[PDB]
Write an enzyme that holds these catalytic residues in place. Structure first.
Site, PDB file in Angstrom:
ATOM      1  N   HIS A 368       4.878  -3.481 -15.640  1.00 46.09           N
ATOM      2  CA  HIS A 368       3.966  -2.803 -14.706  1.00 46.09           C
ATOM      3  C   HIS A 368       4.060  -1.235 -14.791  1.00 46.09           C
ATOM      4  O   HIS A 368       3.693  -0.532 -13.848  1.00 46.09           O
ATOM      5  CB  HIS A 368       4.191  -3.346 -13.192  1.00 46.09           C
ATOM      6  CG  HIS A 368       4.713  -4.785 -12.921  1.00 46.09           C
ATOM      7  ND1 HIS A 368       5.611  -5.489 -13.644  1.00 46.09           N
ATOM      8  CD2 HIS A 368       4.437  -5.613 -11.826  1.00 46.09           C
ATOM      9  CE1 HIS A 368       5.866  -6.647 -13.057  1.00 46.09           C
ATOM     10  NE2 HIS A 368       5.162  -6.730 -11.955  1.00 46.09           N
ATOM     11  N   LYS A 559      -1.789   3.994   0.940  1.00 56.29           N
ATOM     12  CA  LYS A 559      -1.024   4.036  -0.282  1.00 56.29           C
ATOM     13  C   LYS A 559       0.429   4.399  -0.041  1.00 56.29           C
ATOM     14  O   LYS A 559       0.877   4.694   1.064  1.00 56.29           O
ATOM     15  CB  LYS A 559      -1.672   5.046  -1.260  1.00 56.29           C
ATOM     16  CG  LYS A 559      -3.096   4.682  -1.810  1.00 56.29           C
ATOM     17  CD  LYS A 559      -3.437   4.007  -3.142  1.00 56.29           C
ATOM     18  CE  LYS A 559      -3.017   2.557  -3.134  1.00 56.29           C
ATOM     19  NZ  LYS A 559      -3.454   1.741  -4.268  1.00 56.29           N
ATOM     20  N   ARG A 560       1.242   4.247  -1.091  1.00 59.55           N
ATOM     21  CA  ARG A 560       2.597   4.828  -1.150  1.00 59.55           C
ATOM     22  C   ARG A 560       2.355   6.321  -1.135  1.00 59.55           C
ATOM     23  O   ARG A 560       1.501   6.743  -1.942  1.00 59.55           O
ATOM     24  CB  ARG A 560       3.266   4.463  -2.460  1.00 59.55           C
ATOM     25  CG  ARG A 560       4.488   5.273  -2.764  1.00 59.55           C
ATOM     26  CD  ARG A 560       5.140   4.698  -3.964  1.00 59.55           C
ATOM     27  NE  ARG A 560       4.313   4.778  -5.162  1.00 59.55           N
ATOM     28  CZ  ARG A 560       4.925   4.542  -6.335  1.00 59.55           C
ATOM     29  NH1 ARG A 560       5.953   3.695  -6.320  1.00 59.55           N
ATOM     30  NH2 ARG A 560       4.357   4.818  -7.525  1.00 59.55           N
ATOM     31  N   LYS A 565      -1.176   9.486  -6.461  1.00 58.65           N
ATOM     32  CA  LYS A 565      -2.176   8.622  -5.798  1.00 58.65           C
ATOM     33  C   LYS A 565      -3.328   9.414  -5.043  1.00 58.65           C
ATOM     34  O   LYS A 565      -4.233   8.905  -4.355  1.00 58.65           O
ATOM     35  CB  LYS A 565      -1.402   7.697  -4.819  1.00 58.65           C
ATOM     36  CG  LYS A 565      -0.143   6.928  -5.255  1.00 58.65           C
ATOM     37  CD  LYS A 565      -0.322   5.529  -5.878  1.00 58.65           C
ATOM     38  CE  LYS A 565       0.520   4.421  -5.189  1.00 58.65           C
ATOM     39  NZ  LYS A 565       0.778   3.229  -6.009  1.00 58.65           N
ATOM     40  N   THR A 667      -3.483  -4.065  -5.774  1.00 58.54           N
ATOM     41  CA  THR A 667      -3.651  -5.420  -5.273  1.00 58.54           C
ATOM     42  C   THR A 667      -4.255  -5.253  -3.888  1.00 58.54           C
ATOM     43  O   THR A 667      -4.971  -6.110  -3.393  1.00 58.54           O
ATOM     44  CB  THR A 667      -2.223  -5.882  -5.442  1.00 58.54           C
ATOM     45  OG1 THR A 667      -2.221  -5.767  -6.864  1.00 58.54           O
ATOM     46  CG2 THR A 667      -1.716  -7.228  -4.950  1.00 58.54           C
ATOM     47  N   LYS A 671      -7.644  -6.798  -1.807  1.00 60.18           N
ATOM     48  CA  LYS A 671      -7.690  -7.212  -0.407  1.00 60.18           C
ATOM     49  C   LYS A 671      -8.887  -6.553   0.215  1.00 60.18           C
ATOM     50  O   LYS A 671      -9.697  -7.248   0.816  1.00 60.18           O
ATOM     51  CB  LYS A 671      -6.466  -6.781   0.380  1.00 60.18           C
ATOM     52  CG  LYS A 671      -5.201  -7.177  -0.366  1.00 60.18           C
ATOM     53  CD  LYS A 671      -3.953  -6.777   0.339  1.00 60.18           C
ATOM     54  CE  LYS A 671      -2.910  -6.822  -0.717  1.00 60.18           C
ATOM     55  NZ  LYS A 671      -1.718  -6.394  -0.018  1.00 60.18           N
TER      56      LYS A 671
HETATM   57  C1  LIG Z   1      -0.863  -5.584  -0.675  1.00 62.80           C
HETATM   58  C2  LIG Z   1       0.061  -4.612  -0.096  1.00 62.80           C
HETATM   59  C3  LIG Z   1       0.626  -3.742  -0.945  1.00 62.80           C
HETATM   60  C4  LIG Z   1      -0.129  -3.352  -2.160  1.00 62.80           C
HETATM   61  O1  LIG Z   1      -0.526  -1.939  -2.190  1.00 62.80           O
HETATM   62  P1  LIG Z   1      -1.346  -1.361  -3.466  1.00 62.80           P
HETATM   63  O2  LIG Z   1      -2.544  -0.553  -3.055  1.00 62.80           O
HETATM   64  O3  LIG Z   1      -1.864  -2.462  -4.306  1.00 62.80           O
HETATM   65  O4  LIG Z   1      -0.509  -0.492  -4.287  1.00 62.80           O
HETATM   66  C5  LIG Z   1       1.579  -2.887  -0.471  1.00 62.80           C
HETATM   67  N1  LIG Z   1       1.910  -2.826   0.856  1.00 62.80           N
HETATM   68  C6  LIG Z   1       1.304  -3.637   1.699  1.00 62.80           C
HETATM   69  C7  LIG Z   1       1.642  -3.530   3.102  1.00 62.80           C
HETATM   70  C8  LIG Z   1       0.377  -4.546   1.267  1.00 62.80           C
HETATM   71  O5  LIG Z   1      -0.333  -5.282   2.238  1.00 62.80           O
END
Ligand SMILES: *Cc1c(COP(=O)(O)O)cnc(C)c1O
Lengths: 828, 60, 60
Positions: A368, A559-560, A565, A667, A671
């Site tokens: 990844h 996001k993180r 980002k 991911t 969602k």
């Molecule tokens: C799905 C999910 C992730 C995924 O975040 P990304 O945008 O795909 O990097 C991380 N944290 C939480 C709380 C999630 O629900």
């Protein structure tokens, strides 16, 4: 003896028996009563009354896998981002409405009790969310899988915002017991650290080690109404507890306190990757631990599920690839490859070349990263003290691999210094990434443009020498958590038109494409999005507060908080909309509620200056009387699986804005899509496949593409040269550093103005015009509610390529070599 | 006030082209070619102290 | 009703004492061992500060 049987226990699925089984646990299991009970009590009590029903099938599955002895697939990972279990366990087994009616006649509220569960403090983000998604499809596809990972006593910190500044509390999510686990003491195992390698005539030995006990903790994982419930074996370190004499060593010094605190905190804390502060001995200490207490439990299993019998070759590992597959999620299990080799060559005694095909046939690695420095690399000096036999092994693997490499490209010598397992140089290191590929048969990336950029640059010379390895499996989401329990109102109408079928294989949702123009369907999709948004306005006051206007465009970016980002781009356009609304007030702005969420990372200063830029923007814009509801900037607190199960269903636009060519997939991405929101994004990661399934024409793509990111690099990006064209950029930068947004500390955001202006490693300013351009196209179409909803219908009927059941089936079939069934299987 | 773009001198000076060249090519390190890639990317790209700008008038 | 000692597991940042130092690897340990070992009377080897720590623990 035969009357000792599960057959009998639990009657009908009756609220009737379910009220009654809820009263036993409240009193007999909790030893609580009506008068002394808390909502936390009645949760634990309900969560045991689901559980009886839950474990009976886990008995039955695992025993059904004894008799039918299938190959087993062990999903191995440092991070299971498991989220909350009461509602998803009630809906994966049909109980929701019986439990609902039960508790309701018992005088209580379930959606209430459900809210008292706390996210299983067990993962940090991506890598792990995915694990817990792959885990639920892996169940629901009938697969024989196991999740194997570290049980973290205190997860990865909590986000609390004070002063505008992030603050990190500890999560002792083990604080009242976690009902879902069954602590398994009986199956403990030594992991050996440190030691010496003495070479007996019969073999080598790893003599004189520190031992740490690896106690297992076992959590069930049920599938969607099919009855398999699989296992998640998770491990916690425990130092040997003989501390006053044992070894005939003490009465003197106790240094020995420290194994019982340096073994003890092997499972007490996440150390989350591509960061941390210094490649500590503790993380290498943890990779080996989850790996070693597991190849051990693996082999043990292998010898006993009717396996002295499925021999037929001196219990040989000839049938081990037949009956086991080990998936290495990132280079974090990197050592199960050489720990496999130590355990077969020394402890059993297979010859070094028959213990090999077994290993490299038994493993696969999932990659990844896409930017290479990021890849794992332990200094050899470390490996020498701590895992000495293993560095013995990774070296002879390297000697052989570099000789296969020249068995193929003779004369090339410069390729040998690239395909070794060692990076000589500054300080000598063993590049775990090569180890993984070498020790494996299959090397999948997690999105087509990603699995290609592996192939063609990063892992290139391996691509050449062996094609057959390199696979892809783009990333995926499970429709049960991320549609049926987070949005039952959107779930409901898709079934109200095409019945529930989809839940189990998301390509049927493509049928929804046809109702694009049934005017009723359209009013229903938005009836729902208005319903989900007005529960969020509500939570956003009741439990934390603001004045969210229901009717605004819910702009969310979760996001993180890292610099690549881009939430800085996102902050600049809010400061930009705040300026237009303040320059000419009587003009029509489609009102927005911009919500940014995500944890920073301790020790990332920049990531922490951003979280403060955002909250500071928030006190100006949310208080200034000219702007009304026309804008509010909300920083979202302690973003985590259950909050996202709250926000994503209420999102109208989601901000996928990372610099083009920085992300393998995404991911959250999926969602938001399945959940009714337009996406606004750079072409990258998983945007590309979501654009090609939904059609670009329904996706709000923009910015620099990989091509011209590369090209700006050749001419050299000079952020001041864009700042120079564009007036409003100067307007907003000059507010940052004028101290506009931080009244009492003027030079405060100076940290970010300078970085932006001269040292921008990621080209925020480049994409500024184009970003605020697509945004106006977003604001423009939200003014047209039959057409925003008509787009949303195209975007969501298109979700199928993105269920994890797909991703997993291509794992199951093309790598783990098993066909994923979806047959109900019986139970009492 | 002008944003020092380094790749700029990179392109006038054939020598300089030719000496960032040799470094990252792997000239000055054939057992570890990539090595001074760091310094390369410091100089071509993030040089705070303006090396390529004072080159020619120094050589000279 | 019996009492077992648990140490506050805040140790990597609480009160902001740490980062810098863990002498406190011992608060969690001579604390966790207020309940490990029994220490029976009219003997023992020297009126140990651990026993006065077990008895005022049981009492408080
Ligand atoms: C799905 C999910 C992730 C995924 O975040 P990304 O945008 O795909 O990097 C991380 N944290 C939480 C709380 C999630 O629900």
């Amino acid at each position: 003896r035969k009357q000792i049987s599960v057959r009998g226990l639990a009657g009908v699925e009756n609220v009737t028996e379910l009220k009654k089984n809820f009263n036993r646990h409240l009193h007999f299991t909790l030893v609580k009563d009506r008068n002394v009970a808390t909502p936390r009590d009645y949760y634990f009590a309900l969560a045991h009354t689901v559980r009886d029903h839950l474990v009976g099938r886990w008995i039955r599955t695992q025993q059904h896998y004894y008799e039918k002895d299938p190959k087993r697939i062990y999903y191995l990972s440092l991070e299971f981002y498991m989220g909350r279990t009461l509602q998803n366990t009630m809906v994966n087994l049909a109980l929701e409405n019986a439990c609902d009616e039960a508790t309701y006649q018992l005088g209580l509220d379930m959606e209430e009790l459900e809210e008292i569960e706390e996210d299983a403090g067990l993962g940090n983000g991506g890598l792990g969310r995915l694990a817990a998604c792959f885990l639920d499809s892996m169940a629901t596809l009938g697969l024989a899988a196991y999740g194997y990972g570290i049980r973290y006593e205190f997860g990865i910190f909590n986000q609390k915002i004070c002063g505008g500044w992030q603050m990190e509390e500890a999560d002792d999510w083990l604080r009242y017991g976690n009902p879902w686990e069954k602590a398994r003491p009986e199956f403990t195992l030594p992991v050996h650290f440190y030691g010496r390698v003495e070479h007996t005539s019969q073999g080598a030995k790893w003599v004189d080690t520190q031992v740490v006990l690896a106690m297992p903790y076992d959590t069930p994982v049920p599938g969607y109404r099919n009855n398999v419930v699989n296992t998640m074996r998770l491990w916690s370190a425990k130092a040997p507890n003989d501390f006053n004499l044992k070894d005939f060593n003490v009465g003197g010094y106790i240094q020995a306190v420290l194994d019982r605190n340096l073994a003890e905190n092997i499972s007490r804390v996440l150390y989350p990757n591509d960061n941390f502060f210094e490649g500590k001995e503790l993380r290498l200490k943890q990779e080996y631990f989850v790996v070693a207490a597991t190849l051990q439990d693996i082999i043990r299993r292998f010898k006993s599920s009717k396996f002295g019998c499925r021999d037929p070759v001196r219990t040989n590992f000839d049938a081990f690839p037949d009956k086991v597959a080990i998936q290495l999620n990132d280079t974090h299990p990197s050592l199960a490859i050489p720990e496999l080799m130590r355990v077969l060559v020394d402890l059993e005694r297979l010859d070094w070349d028959k213990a090999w095909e077994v290993t490299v046939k038994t493993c696969a690695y999932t990659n990844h990263t896409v930017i290479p420095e990021a890849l794992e690399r332990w200094p050899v000096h470390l490996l020498e003290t701590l895992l000495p036999r293993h560095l013995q092994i990774i070296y002879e693997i390297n000697q052989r691999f570099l000789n296969r490499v020249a068995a193929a490209f003779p004369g090339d010598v410069d390729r040998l210094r690239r395909m070794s397992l060692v990076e000589e140089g500054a300080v000598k290191r063993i590049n775990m990434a090569h180890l993984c590929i070498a020790g494996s048969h299959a090397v999948n990336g997690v999105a087509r443009i990603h699995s290609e950029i592996l192939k063609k640059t990063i892992f290139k010379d391996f691509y050449e020498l062996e094609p057959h390895k390199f696979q892809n499996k783009t990333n995926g989401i499970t429709p049960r958590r991320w549609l049926v329990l987070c949005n039952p109102g959107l779930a409901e109408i898709i079934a109200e038109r095409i019945g529930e079928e989809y839940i189990s294989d998301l390509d049927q949702l493509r049928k929804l494409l046809s109702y694009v123009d049934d005017e009723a369907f359209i009013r229903d999709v938005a009836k729902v999005k208005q319903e989900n948004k007005l529960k969020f306005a509500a939570y956003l006051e009741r439990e934390y507060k603001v004045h969210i206007n229901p009717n605004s465009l819910f702009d969310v970016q979760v996001k993180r908080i890292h610099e690549y980002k881009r939430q800085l781009l996102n902050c600049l356009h809010v400061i930009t909309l705040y300026n237009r609304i303040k320059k000419e007030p009587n003009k029509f702005v489609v009102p927005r509620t911009v919500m940014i969420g995500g944890k920073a990372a301790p020790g990332y200063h920049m990531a922490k200056m951003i979280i403060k830029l955002i909250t500071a923007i928030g006190d100006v814009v949310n208080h200034d009387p000219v702007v009304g509801d026309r804008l509010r900037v909300i920083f979202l607190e302690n973003y985590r699986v259950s909050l996202a199960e709250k926000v994503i269903p209420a999102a109208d636009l989601s901000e996928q804005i990372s610099t083009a060519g920085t992300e393998a997939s995404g991911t959250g991405n999926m969602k938001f899509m399945l959940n009714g929101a337009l996406t606004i994004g750079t072409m990258d990661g998983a945007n590309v496949e979501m654009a090609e399934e939904a059609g670009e024409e329904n996706f709000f793509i923009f910015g620099m593409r990989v091509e011209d990111v590369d090209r700006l690099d050749q001419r050299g990006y000079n952020a001041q040269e864009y700042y120079d064209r564009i007036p409003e950029l100067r307007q907003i930068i000059e507010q940052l550093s004028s101290g506009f947004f931080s009244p009492k500390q003027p030079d405060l955001f100076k940290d970010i103005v300078n970085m932006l202006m001269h040292h921008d490693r990621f080209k925020v300013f480049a994409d500024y015009e184009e970003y605020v351009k697509c945004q106006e196209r977003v604001s423009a179409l939200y003014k047209n509610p039959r057409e925003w909803t008509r787009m949303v219908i195209r975007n969501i009927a298109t979700s199928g390529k993105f269920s994890s059941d797909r991703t997993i089936a291509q794992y199951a079939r093309e790598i783990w070599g098993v066909e994923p069934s979806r047959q109900r299987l019986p139970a009492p």
